[PDB]
Write a protein that binds this DNA or RNA. Structure first.
Lengths: 262, 143, 60, 206, 62
RNA sequence: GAAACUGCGAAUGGCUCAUUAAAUCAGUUAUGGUUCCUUUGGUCGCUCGACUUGGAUAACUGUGGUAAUUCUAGAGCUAA
RNA sequence: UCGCACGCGGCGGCGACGACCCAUUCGAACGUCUGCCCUAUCAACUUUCGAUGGUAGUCGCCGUGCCUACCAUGGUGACCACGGGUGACGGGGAAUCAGGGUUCGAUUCCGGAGAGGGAGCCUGAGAAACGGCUACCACAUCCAAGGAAGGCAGCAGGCG
């Protein structure tokens, strides 16, 4: 090519968006922002395809510019905004707040959070950066360059930031036994405690995660995101709670739900 | 011994002309559990492409092979043998790839047939992209 | 030989054709932005310091 | 134009590559700067990423450094004596990185005569007529004289470095790359570094 | 590029032997007794049974 | 509110498979060997000396040329 | 710099735009290990016109013989090097098979190349762009004979 890509094919869209292929040849190309293209979910998909308020793309265009959608403390009027992990999309008209949390599968789950829960979110830091005048810096998953952080926050800890002020409240130390959120891969959407850390110099470190039901599994540290200390989470949890119980009993639960109600 | 070219070769990091009343030789660790050799610390060789006294960083894959040629100066040629599985005929085939690996003169006694351990880094030349990390002695050869 | 005359102190301009060559020696063989006296172009043109700015060829 | 491409030449084994595309814009190469001695004539050129590179063509001064005394000053370059890469860059006096050039000594000589205030250069027989350094040699405070007298513990200089101070022409090596950033900074040859090219310059003369 | 299926699939498999007396007796029994129209849909139910039979066989090997 | 100056896009998309046989490309890693539109989050009274500086120019008036171009030439102007 | 409310000598709310720099998204680019059709009536090939390495520099966004200057004679190959043909864009994949295989993949997704054939360049962050220019080559157009102007392997469509 001779420059950056601007279009996006419907076939080339990621599988967790669950967009049907019979509608259009193209897919909503996400705009650049604090999250990457693949694991984010555009605001047009969250409204038209997830919540079904809107039918067509022009209908999404009008609603976003009525200034009724407030993503994580700032109103964005772009239909293809890269809404990443746990962006607190707050809707003022109906008094309803959405935080983008993964389901037990790889898809984003439509999770309604309480308004007092909407003021804070958990961000995973990436590096401790020294500024031009001996200024410590932290860079979160959504590229929040927070100067003067708490000095005990390390490379892969998570900070409970506050949305209306843009500053942190607490932080969770990366240690074994703490709760975790597997953000990526085949174990995408899993919730479990951390049981073992394996060191690999040069290569990628892999961390074993014990599930709440005792289904221990491994995951590299790049797709690992702690969510709380011990067995106590710091946010609300969707139904399923990230277990990935095997497909033999989703056959059982789906069959039992139909016959019980009739 | 040294300085046999047109220019003045020296370690760029250190300063060797401070006011007075040996040389403060520069050397760095390499990582991955690799022990820096004694001759690099105490020797008088200076080379910008040495993994210990030069500005090269070891990253990526770590491989191993057998040295076959040493007529080239400051760089050598190693040999790596492997078998490729053919799915039609359930057999293999002997295939070899002889890449060029830089030999820092810190390793002094290196003989043809020694099983060398190399390390990936930035491309030193048109074909050289690997540097010697340790020299394991060949089998036997007590004499 | 059409002459697009322009007088900047009044802002008017008209096209006047001249049909003799002996009056054009004071315009031929000269470059741009030269202060030329137009004393030979006619009886009404005397003491007229005219600057030549160039126009269009016979091919336009 | 002249390009920087690896696929235009042979393989490692010696086979010939066959091109599958024409010349790309990111493989671009430009003609050399080849800056000389003269008044400051530096041409800025746009490079990849919308940045700027300073193509120097004539340079006169440079911020050379004297690392033993931890001092650096701007001095005018006068001559080029040695270049390790090529001998035609000495005859055609061209400045590139790692060139042995000649500079005036007065910017560094006055610093010795101000901060230490001792006679350097100054072949015996003639005294300073402006009298400014003579004033600076004497007339110190009594409490600062002891601090001044401790400056003479390290006021010794090597004979070879002192020898080029006699004629006023110091040998110095270019450290900055001139055709890219536009400057001609560097450092003064000292000790083992200085005595190496003195053997080579004598070998150049014979 | 257009967004559609491009999935064409046969629902029947013709026999390897066209002109044997034994097969002509068997399928002609199946047409008249159950009111079928042609030998194509005769082969069309056989092709569906072949999928179910082959899917069961690989499960017995497991 | 036409036009025009300015800003951005026009390097995306579409077509074709001519060239090309460790080459393209596929799996895996590196940029500690690099550049970056846009977006997002941060900086940007820190420096020791104005209640907002300047003059061009497009549109327009008017003179026109060339068979002819999405060709423009000259003269008065008037903003960022 | 520009736009909305404006409440108290001058300060306040809601913004858009604008830039220096750092991270972020996004690309582009070089490398690393493995994988490619046939051909011996192609067995030696590569090189001082860079061939393979060392030193020092140039240029390049940077690593690098990319290039230059001085040196060493090196580097690949019978495990098929080099060369030639390819009615060869590659892959995910398609047909076909009990099991193994054979053939195809111009073709919707990804990546590469191009706009008749080369070559060079302006702008722009990003092009060696051709629904951008500059020349030569081949074809073709209007002409007043002075001159001017073109690239459907973009959707149609016309000829062969």
């Amino acid at each position: 090519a001779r420059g950056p890509k601007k279009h996006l094919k419907r076939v080339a869209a990621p599988k967790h968006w669950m967009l049907d292929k019979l509608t259009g040849v193209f897919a909503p190309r996400p705009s650049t922002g604090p999250h990457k293209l693949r694991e984010c979910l555009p605001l047009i998909i969250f409204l038209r395809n997830r919540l079904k308020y809107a039918l067509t793309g022009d209908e999404v265009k009008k609603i976003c510019m009525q200034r009724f959608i407030k993503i994580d403390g700032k109103v964005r009027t772009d239909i293809t905004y890269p809404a990443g992990f746990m962006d607190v999309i707050s809707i003022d008209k109906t008094g309803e707040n959405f935080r983008l949390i993964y389901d037990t599968k790889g898809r984003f789950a439509v999770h309604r959070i309480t308004p007092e829960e909407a003021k804070y979110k958990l961000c995973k830091v990436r590096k401790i950066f020294v500024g031009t005048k001996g200024i410590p810096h932290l860079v979160t998953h959504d590229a929040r360059t927070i100067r003067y952080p708490d000095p005990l926050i390390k490379v892969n800890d998570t900070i409970q930031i506050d949305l209306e002020t843009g500053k942190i409240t607490d932080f969770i130390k990366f240690d074994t036994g703490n709760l975790c959120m597997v953000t990526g891969g085949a174990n995408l959407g899993r919730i479990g405690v951390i049981t073992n850390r394996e060191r690999h110099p040069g290569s990628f470190d892999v961390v074993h995660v014990k599930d709440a039901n005792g289904n221990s599994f491994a995951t590299r540290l790049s797709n690992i995101f702690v969510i709380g200390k011990g067995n106590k989470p710091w946010i609300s949890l969707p139904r399923g709670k990230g277990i990935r119980l095997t497909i033999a009993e989703e056959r059982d639960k789906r069959l039992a739900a139909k016959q019980s109600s009739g | 011994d040294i300085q046999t070219e047109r220019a003045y070769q020296k370690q760029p990091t250190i300063f060797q002309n401070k006011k007075r009343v040996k040389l403060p030789r520069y050397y760095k660790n390499i990582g991955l559990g690799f022990k820096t050799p004694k001759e690099a610390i105490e020797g008088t060789y200076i080379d910008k492409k040495c993994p210990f006294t030069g500005n090269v960083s070891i990253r990526g894959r770590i491989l191993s092979g057998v040295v076959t040629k040493m007529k080239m100066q400051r760089t050598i040629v190693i040999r790596r043998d492997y078998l490729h599985y053919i799915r039609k005929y359930n057999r293999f085939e002997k295939r070899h790839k002889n890449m060029s690996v830089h030999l820092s003169p810190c390793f002094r006694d290196v003989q043809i047939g020694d099983i060398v351990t190399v390390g990936e880094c930035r491309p030193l030349s048109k074909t050289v992209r690997f540097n010697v990390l340790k020299v394991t002695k060949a089998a036997g050869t007590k004499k | 030989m059409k002459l697009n005359i322009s007088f900047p102190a009044t802002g008017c301009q008209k096209l006047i054709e001249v049909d003799d060559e002996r009056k054009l020696r004071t315009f031929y063989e000269k470059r741009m932005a030269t202060e030329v006296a137009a004393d030979a172009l006619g009886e009404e043109w005397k003491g007229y310091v005219v600057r030549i700015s160039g126009g269009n060829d016979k091919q336009g | 134009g002249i390009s920087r491409d690896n696929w235009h030449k042979r393989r490692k084994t010696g086979g010939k590559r066959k091109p599958y595309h024409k010349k790309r814009k990111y493989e671009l190469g430009r003609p050399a700067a080849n800056t000389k001695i003269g008044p400051r004539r530096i041409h800025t050129v746009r490079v990849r990423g919308g940045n700027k590179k300073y193509r120097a063509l004539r340079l006169d001064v440079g911020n050379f450094s004297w690392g033993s005394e931890c001092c650096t000053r701007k001095t005018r370059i006068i001559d080029v004596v040695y270049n390790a890469s090529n001998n035609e860059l000495v005859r055609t006096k061209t400045l590139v990185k790692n060139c042995i050039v000649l500079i005036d000594s007065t910017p560094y000589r006055q610093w010795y005569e101000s901060h230490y205030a001792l006679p350097l250069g100054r072949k015996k027989g003639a005294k300073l007529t402006p009298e400014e350094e003579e004033i600076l040699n004497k007339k110190r405070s009594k409490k600062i004289q002891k601090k001044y007298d401790e400056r003479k513990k390290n006021a010794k200089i090597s004979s070879l470095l002192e020898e080029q101070f006699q004629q006023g022409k110091l040998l110095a090596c270019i450290a900055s790359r001139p055709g890219q950033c536009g400057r001609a900074d560097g450092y003064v040859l000292e000790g083992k570094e200085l005595e190496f090219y003195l053997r080579k310059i004598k070998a150049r003369k014979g | 590029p257009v967004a559609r299926s491009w999935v064409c699939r046969k629902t029947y498999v013709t026999p390897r032997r066209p002109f044997e007396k034994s097969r002509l007796d068997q399928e002609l029994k199946l047409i008249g007794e159950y009111g079928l129209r042609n030998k194509r849909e005769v082969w069309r139910v056989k092709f569906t049974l072949a999928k179910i039979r082959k899917a069961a066989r690989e499960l017995l090997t497991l």
